[PDB]
Amino acid sequence: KLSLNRQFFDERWSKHRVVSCLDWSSQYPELLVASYNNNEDAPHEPDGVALVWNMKYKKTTPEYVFHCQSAVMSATFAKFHPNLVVGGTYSGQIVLWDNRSNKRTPVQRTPLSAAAHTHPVYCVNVVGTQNAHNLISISTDGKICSWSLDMLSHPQDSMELVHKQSKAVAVTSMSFPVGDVNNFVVGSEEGSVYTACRHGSKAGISEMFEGHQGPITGIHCHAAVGAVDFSHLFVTSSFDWTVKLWSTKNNKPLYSFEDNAGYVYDVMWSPTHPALFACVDGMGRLDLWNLNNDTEVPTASISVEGNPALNRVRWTHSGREIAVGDSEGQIVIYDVGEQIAVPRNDEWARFGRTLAEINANRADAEEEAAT
Amino acid sequence: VHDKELAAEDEQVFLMKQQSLLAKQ
Amino acid sequence: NLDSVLSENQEHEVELELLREDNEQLLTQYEREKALRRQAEEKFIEFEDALEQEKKELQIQVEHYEFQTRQLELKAKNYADQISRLEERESEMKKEYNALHQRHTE
Amino acid sequence: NLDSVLSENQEHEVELELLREDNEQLLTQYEREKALRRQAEEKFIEFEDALEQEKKELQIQVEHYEFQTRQLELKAKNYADQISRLEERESEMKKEYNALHQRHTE
Amino acid sequence: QSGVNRWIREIQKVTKLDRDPASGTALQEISFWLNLERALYRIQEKRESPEVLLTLDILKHGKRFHATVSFDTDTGLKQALETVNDYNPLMKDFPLNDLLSATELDKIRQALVAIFTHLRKIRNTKYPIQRALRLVEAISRDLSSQLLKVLGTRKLMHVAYEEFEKVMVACFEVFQTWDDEYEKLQVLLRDIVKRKREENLKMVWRINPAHRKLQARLDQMRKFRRQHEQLRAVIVRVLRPQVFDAADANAIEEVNLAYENVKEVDGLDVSKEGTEAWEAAMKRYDERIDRVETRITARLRDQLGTAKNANEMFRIFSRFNALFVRPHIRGAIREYQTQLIQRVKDDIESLHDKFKVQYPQSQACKMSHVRDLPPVSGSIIWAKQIDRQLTAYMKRVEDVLGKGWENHVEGQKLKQDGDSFRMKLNTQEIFDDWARKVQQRNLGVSGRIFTIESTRVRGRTGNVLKLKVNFLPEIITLSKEVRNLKWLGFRVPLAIVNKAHQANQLYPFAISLIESVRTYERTCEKVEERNTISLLVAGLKKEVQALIAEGIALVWESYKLDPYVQRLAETVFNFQEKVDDLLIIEEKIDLEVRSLETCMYDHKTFSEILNRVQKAVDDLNLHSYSNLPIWVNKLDMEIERILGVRLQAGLRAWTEMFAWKMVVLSLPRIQSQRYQVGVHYELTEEEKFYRNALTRMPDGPVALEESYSAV
């Protein structure tokens, strides 16, 4: 069952704004960073607001407030620095807020040069270990830069992503596999998912996936690791009212969940349940798809009050409370039941049998309908 | 000895002069 | 007249430094534009090669399809002439059968 | 000390004129290279759009030929059925005509 | 004469020899024609021996004419010789010997093309068309026998499905090869007939090939096994118990035993007994299958009782996807057709209600603007997605109701509704309206980079004139729309693409100039908020305005635009962080000054507060703010006045004199420019300590006299 747990809405900052990104801290799993876009009704107010809310405390105020000059498009936590909030804004700067400083103004920012990003940055991440971690960012012109978290003045590595006839893929979202620093996947607004490799002899776009018929909003790789490896799988959510499930082997969509209503704005694999993923749609409905239970209807659906358009969803690292941001800035926390969240000990083998049954039935139906 | 202060000009007349510089050249 | 020569010397120094920096900037940017034009010509020649082979494949499919259309339409008009003659012949000896049937009837 | 400062003035003058005309040469080289690169991009974009347009025309012709071949093949199949049916009917009426000559026989 | 008549009979029993073409195989006819031609040539060379002509010359010398006329006219030698030499070029080589030893179906096909290409030599011969037709029938009989032997050896019945399917696929392509090669041969004999109208009076063919009925049998076998396979698919699919009845296991065993009992019956027997065995087997199979067919239909009814929405009914109708052609579930679809049409009509009306709200009034435009999509391309994607969902609904309805759902009244009004929605959902008019607007407006960037423009801001009567960068937002949106619409298959004109490429190559300087101008305006607004510190940042504002006045003369196509943009961005960032640090440290200075009134009267806390203020002023001096000593003097008068008021309070609290007086009077003064060293000037007591607090006495020195009168 799905139930409301907590509602976050700040009166001064998060009013008349649409949530743009959500993240939970890896070290401190009760902390949510929530990006925001510009309120057009208040030009004197800062364009980009990044709030940090707390789960343990029962107050309604944001625990930290940051704001940049330009509209913040994607802000995450630093995975190996506990004090930094790294945001990527509309102008292409990568601002780096600090919490120990007395200022809400960023303490570090990248230049707007040709050696750095220039178009809006919609995907930033921190990859690596303690001894070797980097910040990866891709703009919407397809430029990918790998920075170090100290020297944000020029990138350590940088390239332009091009697949065919040196045409620039316009990257909208980016995901990384579990335990991988080299390979990653990108979803463009041209409708095409591309896999890619960071460094090596072949650096850049590796393959191509045809798939969708609209801009791709959110792509997430598989997170839960158990008896059977599933890191080659990922899910995508796009503008054509579908959620498409893929693997890196097959060049075709393995399944196309048509959310017959409104668009689909974000999707995300659960980090504990290996067969569960959540998606949001455009009329406020949040759906959970458990593939071991049923692959045609949502397992559990909820609707936020007033039905606003939902932008982003994000699971906690415990897989128990998910966070969803809407068009009014109202961060809502939804607590899933233990019958849906906690997996059984045979759930990886059951998902392997379910994936084999999906593959066999769909391929057999296709080859028996075509011939 | 005490030196008198330097001050940047008022912004309105400054970029009004720069508007004249833009239009004349 | 030492002060005038000193003023001339410092003015010449500031002009020298200014247009030396202008020289270095112009050289670097000219190298940049040459490299970018080389990149553009490389894009032109590769895209040339690739889609020219694609165009030749599609043209091959085009006049193959034209050959198929021509032979099928020729078979169709041969069929047209033969059924026209067949129905004409069947109708005339049907009339002959009717006349001979009335001959047997009377 | 007019000798040394006038020597500095003289060296400043000759180096300023020399690398000033060198600067004018690089500025001319810059303007030529910028014009060349701009014309290369314009030619590339024209070639893009014209050749992609004629590609789309070839795709339209391929689809039209496919549809024409399908409908003409359908015409040939059902019309061959017409040939077989009318041939069977005229065979039957030939048989009844032979029965009528049999009726004349006895 | 008697031996002449003996020779006449001996060659008349051979020249009249003829073989019926309907009887026997083709190879028997080939061997007969070859042997007859060879024997006729043998008796021809024996006829032309000189001793025979010697006997005819002797009989001519004996006036026995009748034997000579018999040997000249009644022989029939010349006509039979012309017959066997007219049929010779067709009969010389013939390819059925390769067919008789062929074992694989492609070898059968290549023997077929060899035979039918060898049959093309009839056009130069006087072969009768009816004998050619009987020869083709004999070829078909030999084909039927050979491929029956091949199919009997391969044993297609008891073996698995896929390779059995592919060997009948190869057999049916062999039958197609026979069909079109017979078509080519038939038009060849037609064109042969068109040259001999008065000779042959037998127009119709009426050929019945022997293999054809077997082909029909194989065709029946094809669909039969196909049906069985499809049935077995759903019988392992839907028959699972939804969370174990004997009905589902009875269905699995009924299908298995029905297929076994039809597997016992041989299907390759083309005879009448084989035909009636085939018919009895299919009647038994239909009787065994109809029970589980009725069970499947009843479970479809019970499954449709609990199904409410259109997508649910489509998802459960596609579970029985392989049984749409069996003529019992079609009645169940016909009974439930009206509910499907009504509910699909409701879904179409729901999509029409979505599209009824316009694009700028909807949330899709807002969420596309959030995710960086320009509004015309977002509207195009919106209309294309509604059209795609309409096409998906029509495709699903057509696929479930069969082709030919148009003729009903509900079907024709549903098609009318879909047609109206599709012509309301066109996307081309929006595209060339946008193209006409952009081509009329005729955008493009050139000239100098900055622009002064005077606007009327509310709250101010005077027209406030502002500075912007010469780069319209419509340039950036036009570049985004060109990059979006070139993806979408829409042809955009040349000037728009060239303008977009110039904009994309000039964008990184323009966005940095826009950010620097906005940062400078925000920092100047923050400075104008606090008028008290305007003289501290006079040097930085002077430097930034000097840089703006330097760069206002630059053109967009200049070569100096690359380092100037970086220099301006660095200077404006430094100016902004200096102003923010000045704001923080001036708030600290004001807090420490306002806390001097509430600080209790002692030397140590006054010295600590003055040390903190001196440290803040020292940090002001380290970053070298402009006009520091004037602002320090203006602060020094205020803190001296505060110390005078506190001296009044301390003196009237007393009403050992100098011990109480040296608490305030020995406090060190604030030094503005103290980082300078080398100048050996020593400040006196009045400019090092607050010795002029009696000059800043708020009530005048009369209270000092009140301190002197008590002693």
Add this chain to the structure above:
Amino acid sequence: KMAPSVEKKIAELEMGLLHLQQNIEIPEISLPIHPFLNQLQSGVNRWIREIQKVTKLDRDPASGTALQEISFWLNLERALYRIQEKRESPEVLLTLDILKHGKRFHATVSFDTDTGLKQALETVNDYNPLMKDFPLNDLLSATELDKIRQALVAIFTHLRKIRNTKYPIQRALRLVEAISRDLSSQLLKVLGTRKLMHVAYEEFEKVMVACFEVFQTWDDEYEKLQVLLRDIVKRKREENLKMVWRINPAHRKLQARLDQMRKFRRQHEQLRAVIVRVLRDAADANAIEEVNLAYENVKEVDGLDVSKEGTEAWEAAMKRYDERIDRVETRITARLRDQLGTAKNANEMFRIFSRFNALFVRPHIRGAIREYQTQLIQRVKDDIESLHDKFKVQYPQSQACKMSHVRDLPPVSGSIIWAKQIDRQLTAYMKRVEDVLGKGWENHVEGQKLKQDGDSFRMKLNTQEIFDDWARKVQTLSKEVRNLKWLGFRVPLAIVN
């Protein structure tokens, strides 16, 4: 200059005899004659058959060297002139005349038209402006890279006479591909002589920039030739119905292999110089022999082979080198992490951070030592605040003024010595910060505030105005004169005397 030139002429004689050996040759036919009309018909039919045998000669240009093509066209030209001069002999004209007298018009017509001598001779005469005096012998005879460069520019300036002939442009492109083929072969021969793996880095870099200059010369001469080919194609539109412009030269793979080899060798030299500098225990010797073993493991693989097995061997050797270098890097990270087991005071830790600074170019070594740098930067921030507090008091209020008064130092020069000592301590602290944060400390998170504070502090440490004020007021003095000339101030001439 005698014996190397003699050796080059000897190699030129050997190369000349090599293509005289391997020259594809045309069989020289001979027209026989009678030592009656039907015998002449058979003889002239043998003539027509052998002339059609010679004149139908053609060669696929996609195979073989370019010198084979040049020699083939030259030999065809010579053979066609020999056939033309043999056909115009008086005896051949005589037997053709008496065949014309015999009214055997078939022989005369078939010897007039069906021989195909006219159009073949016209075609080879049209081609012969390009085929003469071709300079590819200079390419196959050169061993120095500048010689290869001038041979390449001579070949590409010979190629500009396409405008005279009616050569097929596709055949010209395959000729260019053959030029690329034997250019790659000669470059492989020269670099195999040069033994690039066995040489030091400086000569390796000289031959790499020379070979890439050769590649660059090929590049722009190819763009000029391609411009001329586009000019000659758009001017002759009716001649060629179909036209493709694709070409894959055979030297680009060798260029990419050389680029990858040079980019490997630069990284290996950069690591090995640092390792042999600063790692002079068993761990140091272990690391240097592992580095030498990795270099020898790559070195034993013949990198000049461009084939598929050579490519796989190069990738295997580079993968083994990368894994060995990663093992050496982890070993030296574990060696550097033993600092707190030895360094307790920050001063000797500063010293071993200065001695071992050259490992911090690598990203793993820089990212591993992270929590140390915050403490070190905090220590230098404390020392910078202490240096500010030493400048909190001024020189007249300092004890250094009394120490300068006692030890016979004038107060102005004592102030200048005091300020220069403060500046020296500030520069030492900035050198320490640069050592701690490595190269590029000026754009770090913590080093930026340090750099800004050091710059604004050095702006207030200038001593020009004190010297100027002293020189203005003075216009004990000899003490100023002989102290201020040590400090680099240009004293006035009137004050020295």
